[PDB]
């Protein structure tokens, strides 16, 4: 049936786009594989005190993958880098009412958050 929570991320898109991969304050997570029907790119922008002040995403995948990545991108804004690691696949699935056959989407969005944060943290060691 129709999932209003998931369809909203496509019909009313938010944070779709790109950040500058060369910035020391941008982390880029790119996870999934075209052959598995789900690729998520999630970028975060962190200010000089460790607060994520912006994020952007691009996703190739079903609507629940687009909603999972889109929700993750909204949710990292205003978290510190340490708070953003709190975010769990299960909170994402709960918010979106994901059925069990789509829970892999919320796990991949969690993977993307952590990949973006690990990219940011690797840039940080002077």
């Amino acid at each position: 049936a129709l999932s209003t929570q998931v369809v909203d991320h496509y019909e009313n898109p938010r944070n779709v786009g790109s950040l500058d991969k060369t910035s020391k304050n941008v982390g880029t997570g790119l996870v999934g594989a075209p052959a598995c029907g789900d690729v998520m790119k999630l970028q975060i922008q962190v200010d000089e005190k460790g607060k994520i002040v912006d994020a952007r995403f691009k996703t190739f995948g079903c609507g629940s993958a687009i909603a999972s990545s889109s929700l993750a991108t909204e949710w990292v804004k205003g978290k510190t880098v340490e708070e953003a690691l709190t975010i769990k696949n299960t909170d994402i699935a709960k918010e979106l009412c994901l059925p069990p056959v789509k829970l892999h989407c919320s796990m991949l969005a969690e993977d993307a958050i952590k990949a973006a944060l690990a990219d940011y943290k690797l840039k940080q060691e002077p």
Partner: protein, 402 residues
């Protein structure tokens, strides 16, 4: 309370032709007798309607009515043809041939026979979706009892060379079954010119009611089949159970209507199909048709939209009823084995959409579908990291994916 989406999914099922519902209704109201009731008028008139319907089915395919056995659908007919022939000649024959793009009931019937000790060759198809006739010939063995090849593919609409396959099987005295569920009443079928021994028919793929079908079983030369449904011997001992008069009336009426309308429908659907394909491909780059257009039923159009996931495009086309090859949508099951069989790259197979054009489809509906498809593919590509990478000159076939 909101407006309904356009129906562009005729390969999944069709609406009932008003002529078919009209023919059925008397049997749902006053003519409710059991066609097997031999001693009163309710039975006599119900039996006569059944035998009328049987002649209507026979006329459409060039058969004798005695060769028509009613079933609950093409699923049941395919089970009867494959398991019935295999089990009957099992003393002398244990090999069957089919293809890798058959419908799941043919494939799973063959899988069940393998667990029974039968040998099955699943023929590959070429990238066109068409079998190699010479590979079929080479595969026939001395203990080969049956060849089963579908007339029109339900997913990509390609047409197999049925007449040429019949010539091969006839000449080697191998029974030839064709699942014609997607072809009956849409393209010419003649069991004698095509040398068909068995054929599966579905009522709901041809503007008839759901829950009914038929199997043609050639009586000269006689093809023998072991019955699968046990019971009191209805349908000449081949399909025990109560023949559902209203449903078979609706199937025969659908067949008669299709016989009268096939040529008109083919001309109109061909033109709408050309329009849909050419208008999409001239407005979007990286769109590929799955299946050879030279051997193709125009009402089933399967296209891939590179860098966009199929289910997300279906979601985006919120007011159009369509279907896709992405594993998330097919029945919560598996990816498209058909697209894999014709050598589609896995990512493109996630990107395929099936458009169905039928008897009631309008030029308006096609144009609306085309317009929305162009807008949403462009929008999903703008959201796609794969499109972004290709636009920046990156070779996707060179990334180390996680």
């Amino acid at each position: 309370s909101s407006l309904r989406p356009l129906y562009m999914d005729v390969q999944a099922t069709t609406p009932l032709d008003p002529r078919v519902l009209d023919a059925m209704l008397p049997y749902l109201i006053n003519y409710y007798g059991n066609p097997h009731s031999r001693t009163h008028a309710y039975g006599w008139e119900s039996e006569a309607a059944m035998e009328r319907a049987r002649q209507q089915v026979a006329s459409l395919i060039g058969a004798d009515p005695r060769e028509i056995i009613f079933t609950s659908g093409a699923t049941e007919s395919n089970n009867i043809a494959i398991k019935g022939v295999a089990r009957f000649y099992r003393s002398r024959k244990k090999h069957l041939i089919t293809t890798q793009t058959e419908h799941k009931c043919v494939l799973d019937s063959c899988r069940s026979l393998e667990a029974e000790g039968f040998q099955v060759t699943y023929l590959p198809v070429q990238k066109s979706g068409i079998i190699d006739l010479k590979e079929l010939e080479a595969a026939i063995q001395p203990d080969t009892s049956l060849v089963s090849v579908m007339t029109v593919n339900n997913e990509i609409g390609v047409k197999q060379p049925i007449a040429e396959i019949g010539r091969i099987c006839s000449s080697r005295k191998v029974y030839f079954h064709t699942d014609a569920a997607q072809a009956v009443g849409k393209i010419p079928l003649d069991v004698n010119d095509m040398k068909i021994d068995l054929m599966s028919i579905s009522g709901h793929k041809i503007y008839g009611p759901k829950g009914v079908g038929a199997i043609y079983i050639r009586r000269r030369p006689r093809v023998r089949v072991e019955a699968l449904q046990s019971g009191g011997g209805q349908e000449r001992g081949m399909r025990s159970g109560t023949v559902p008069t209203p449903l078979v009336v609706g199937l025969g009426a659908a067949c008669e209507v299709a016989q009268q309308e096939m040529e008109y429908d083919h001309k109109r659907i061909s033109k709408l199909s050309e329009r849909l394909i050419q208008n999409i491909m001239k407005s979007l780059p990286d769109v590929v048709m799955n299946g050879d257009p030279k051997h193709h039923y125009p009402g089933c159009i399967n296209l891939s939209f590179a860098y966009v996931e199929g289910e997300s495009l279906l979601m985006a086309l919120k007011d159009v009823a369509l279907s896709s090859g992405s594993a998330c949508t097919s029945a919560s099951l598996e990816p498209s084995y058909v697209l894999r069989a014709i050598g589609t790259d896995e990512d493109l197979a996630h990107s395929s959409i099936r458009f169905g054009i039928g008897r009631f489809t309008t030029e308006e509906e096609v144009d609306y579908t085309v317009e929305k498809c162009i807008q949403h593919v462009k929008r999903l590509r703008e959201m796609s990291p794969l499109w972004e990478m290709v636009q920046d000159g990156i070779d996707l076939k060179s990334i180390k994916w996680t």
